[PDB]
């Protein structure tokens, strides 16, 4: 017992506004005191990013897939409102898309229960992860208008000699709408990787939701290849680990997600995912209660950050002297949930039992009545809210660093 | 003072199995004895349909077209099981595919809620009705799987030999899927004028989901037809009813859901019609506490029915000696209803009355503790149920029969 010390090291991307205001108060109060960590720092803030003409966004990413993990602080992604505001070179691509696309993998979303604040759903116990394919089937699509009477016809030619094949899809006479969408056997393995890996890490059970009752030939593609995939890699590891996959009716599997206790992940197809990420995270509680977590498709490979912005709003009056009750515990699990993939991957149970005790410290935090504003709202309501029922950031940090001091002496010798 | 009666004409389809006895039982209890109404009867019994090649079918469904209002009962559906049960014919559509082809319009689902019998998310207050497009888009579309390299393309063909479009959807260099799909303008418009009409009938406000921020001709098209019908036909009507109509996306309008209270109409497209109606299924609590009703797009025709099917294993279970508890009151409020819309459209206030109050009543003797079993294991749970805590299928029938005279009789000296 002394400062942790991993092996390995982790990469640190730090962000803008209200999330950097917190993320140093995190790492100050609750990370450095505890554990003696090997950082990579990399600075995302907007000002750094158009300084470099967004290079520290490519290094970060390239520094994440060598070390393994990164947390990452909220980052603002470039519009024509902050072109002006921050005086930028080009309007830079969103930080997420670009490590996204150089990491490659599937982001998962875990939210963060405890007792006293309730889900909108009353049998939700476990935390149910979407899993979000999130390569084109309609986000990579061909639709267009029909404003003559014609014939929608669609094609297949091989890039061979080969000889066309062709479908007669419909016959308009009034107006009407056509669209065509596709997806890649590549892509579909790569995120049943994703899943599987992500499955086996959590040792939950993985489901995959598709309506191949309907689409016998597309979702069908996404059935076959999971079964695959599970068959030749996967069904062995999960036997030993106590889990199993399965998969399900679109239909069968929202009903699943209403009637059920949660433990799973859940594998969503592009839309899908869109779609039910958003009913569950209204149904789980505080946008500061989620992290998101991208895992390659090989599983050495993760990206941690909470599961909201910058929040813009809450950095105006940080700026003006106001005090501030943004909810950070999604930030502080970022930092826990990335620690946690170190220490499995090099093996430092030391490590691991820290992230565990403090997480375990949030919850029990939040447990005793001590909470932000956010929280605090979900339990009493929109009103019945006075500033005696709620803690500032700060003082929330600090009687979570009080709580997990308390915990963290341990076997003093 | 003896009955109330009304001119305008009722068709009734009478079904099969569980719900066909059930039907018989709430039409000599609870509606007949309250109420002459002219009633043109059609047999959808799998044998009567057998025998008569499934015309009667069809003239259920044009006679409610005609006359503007039909109650119906659960019915088999033919699988290669079914023809060997009754006799073998052939394999037979469904009655309801049929009867909603020919009437055209959209179905839309109505809960029953109690206050003791809680729902799954605990915002859910008032009904959030659910109207599914069911035409078009991933039902009616064309898929298959890519295997060669090669190129996916879509081309439009006018009817006129004018100059063909084509699109240019991806080059597959291993393997993938691909699919195209249609709607028409002819039924997003009758589809959007049976929201409307719906939405205006029952003074609740209108909600379309799409996901035009993606599918921006695709979608945009289910916005631009529904927005030019508000401005043109029902801003007016619905200003003067005190409700509106807006569009969402789909992501919000999910979100929006679990957090809203209820109170309006929600307009699916076909596949999130599909997927989320299951969610709201589970929400709301059991099947025998919704109705399905088809509103045809001139908002005259209305054909309503229970939201479950015909009960086959309470009918396995039927009268082998062993009774049964099935809910009756999506049966119930099958009639209540259907006579609601008949007498709106007669403007036969007396007939109106007599619908609320028995809706009201039902919702009462539920409050007070008479109960079906299903309505009994909800209130809690599997182990704690005795008979003791319920009543069987004819005993709560006859339950609101009794607790339905007291409340007619409010007509004093
Ligand atoms: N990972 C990322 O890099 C990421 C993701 C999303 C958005 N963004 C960026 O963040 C900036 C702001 O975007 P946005 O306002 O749309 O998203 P946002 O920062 O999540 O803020 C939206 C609102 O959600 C509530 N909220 C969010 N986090 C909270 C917390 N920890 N505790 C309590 N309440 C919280 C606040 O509502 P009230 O003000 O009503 O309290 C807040 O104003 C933009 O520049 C955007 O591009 C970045
Ligand atoms: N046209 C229609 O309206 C329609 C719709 C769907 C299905 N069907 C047809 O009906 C037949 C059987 O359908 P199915 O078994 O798939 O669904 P179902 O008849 O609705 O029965 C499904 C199960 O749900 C429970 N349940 C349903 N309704 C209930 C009620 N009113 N009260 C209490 N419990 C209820 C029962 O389980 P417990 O006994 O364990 O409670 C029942 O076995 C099939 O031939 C099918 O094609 C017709
Ligand atoms: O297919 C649908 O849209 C509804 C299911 C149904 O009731 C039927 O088709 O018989
Ligand atoms: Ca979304
Ligand atoms: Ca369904």
Same mark, same amino acid.
């Given at each position: 017992?002394?400062?942790? &010390? +991993? =092996?390995?090291?982790? $990469?640190?991307?730090? *962000?803008?506004?209200?999330? !950097?205001? @917190?993320?140093?108060?995190?790492? /100050?109060?609750?990370?450095?005191?505890?554990?003696?960590?090997?950082?990579?720092?990399?600075?995302?803030?907007?000002?750094?990013?158009?300084?470099?003409?967004?290079?520290?966004?490519?290094?970060?990413?390239?520094?994440?897939?060598?070390?393994?993990?990164?947390?990452?602080?909220?980052?603002?992604?470039?519009?024509?409102?902050?072109?002006?505001?921050?005086?930028?070179?080009?309007?830079?691509?969103?930080?997420?898309?670009?490590?996204?696309?150089?990491?490659?993998?599937?982001?998962?979303?875990?939210?963060?229960?405890?007792?006293?604040?309730?889900?909108?759903?009353?049998?939700?116990?476990?935390?149910?992860?979407?899993?979000?394919?999130?390569?084109?089937?309609?986000? &990579? +699509? =061909?639709?267009?208008? $029909?404003?003559?009477? *014609?014939?929608?016809?669609? !094609?297949? @030619?091989?890039?061979?000699?080969? /000889?066309?094949?062709?479908?007669?899809?419909?016959?308009?006479?009034?107006?009407?709408?056509?669209?065509?969408?596709?997806?890649?056997?590549?892509?579909?393995?790569?995120?049943?990787?994703?899943?599987?890996?992500?499955?086996?890490?959590?040792?939950?059970?993985?489901?995959?939701?598709?309506?191949?009752?309907?689409?016998?030939?597309?979702?069908?593609?996404?059935?076959?290849?999971?079964?695959?995939?599970?068959?030749?890699?996967?069904?062995?590891?999960?036997?030993?680990?106590?889990?199993?996959?399965?998969?399900?009716?679109?239909?069968?599997?929202?009903?699943?997600?209403?009637?059920?206790?949660?433990?799973?992940?859940?594998?969503?197809?592009?839309?899908?995912?869109?779609?039910?990420?958003?009913?569950?995270?209204?149904?789980? *509680?505080?946008?500061?209660?989620?992290?998101?977590?991208?895992?390659?498709?090989?599983?050495?490979?993760?990206?941690?950050?909470?599961?909201?912005?910058?929040?813009?709003?809450?950095?105006?009056?940080?700026?003006?002297?106001?005090?501030?009750?943004?909810?950070?515990?999604?930030?502080?699990?970022?930092?826990?949930?990335?620690?946690?993939?170190?220490?499995?991957?090099?093996?430092?149970?030391?490590?691991?039992?820290?992230?565990?005790?403090?997480?375990?410290?949030?919850?029990?935090?939040?447990?005793?009545?001590?909470?932000?504003?956010?929280?605090?709202?979900?339990?009493?309501?929109?009103?019945?809210?006075?500033?005696?029922?709620?803690?500032?950031?700060?003082?929330?940090?600090?009687?979570?660093?009080?709580?997990?001091?308390?915990?963290?002496?341990?076997?003093?010798?």
């Amino acid at each position: 017992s002394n400062k942790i &010390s +991993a =092996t390995g090291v982790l $990469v640190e991307l730090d *962000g803008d506004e209200m999330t !950097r205001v @917190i993320w140093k108060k995190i790492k /100050e109060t609750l990370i450095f005191p505890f554990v003696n960590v090997p950082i990579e720092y990399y600075d995302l803030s907007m000002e750094n990013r158009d300084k470099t003409e967004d290079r520290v966004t490519v290094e970060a990413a390239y520094a994440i897939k060598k070390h393994g993990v990164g947390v990452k602080c909220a980052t603002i992604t470039p519009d024509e409102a902050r072109v002006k505001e921050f005086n930028l070179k080009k309007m830079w691509r969103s930080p997420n898309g670009t490590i996204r696309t150089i990491l490659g993998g599937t982001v998962f979303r875990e939210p963060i229960i405890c007792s006293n604040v309730p889900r909108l759903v009353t049998t939700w116990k476990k935390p149910v992860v979407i899993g979000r394919h999130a390569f084109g089937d309609q986000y &990579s +699509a =061909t639709d267009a208008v $029909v404003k003559e009477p *014609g014939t929608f016809e669609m !094609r297949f @030619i091989p890039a061979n000699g080969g /000889e066309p094949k062709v479908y007669k899809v419909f016959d308009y006479k009034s107006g009407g709408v056509m669209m065509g969408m596709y997806n890649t056997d590549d892509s579909i393995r790569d995120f049943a990787r994703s899943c599987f890996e992500f499955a086996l890490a959590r040792k939950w059970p993985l489901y995959l939701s598709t309506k191949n009752t309907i689409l016998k030939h597309y979702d069908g593609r996404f059935k076959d290849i999971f079964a695959e995939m599970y068959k030749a890699l996967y069904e062995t590891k999960f036997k030993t680990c106590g889990i199993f996959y399965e998969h399900r009716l679109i239909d069968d599997m929202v009903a699943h997600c209403m009637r059920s206790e949660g433990g799973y992940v859940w594998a969503c197809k592009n839309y899908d995912g869109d779609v039910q990420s958003d009913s569950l995270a209204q149904g789980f *509680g505080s946008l500061g209660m989620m992290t998101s977590i991208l895992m390659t498709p090989d599983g050495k490979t993760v990206e941690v950050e909470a599961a909201h912005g910058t929040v813009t709003r809450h950095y105006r009056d940080y700026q003006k002297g106001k005090e501030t009750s943004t909810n950070p515990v999604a930030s502080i699990f970022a930092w826990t949930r990335a620690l946690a993939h170190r220490a499995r991957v090099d093996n430092n149970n030391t490590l691991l039992e820290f992230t565990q005790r403090l997480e375990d410290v949030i919850i029990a935090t939040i447990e005793a009545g001590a909470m932000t504003e956010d929280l605090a709202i979900c339990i009493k309501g929109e009103k019945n809210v006075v500033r005696a029922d709620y803690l500032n950031t700060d003082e929330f940090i600090d009687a979570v660093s009080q709580r997990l001091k308390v915990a963290m002496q341990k076997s003093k010798v």
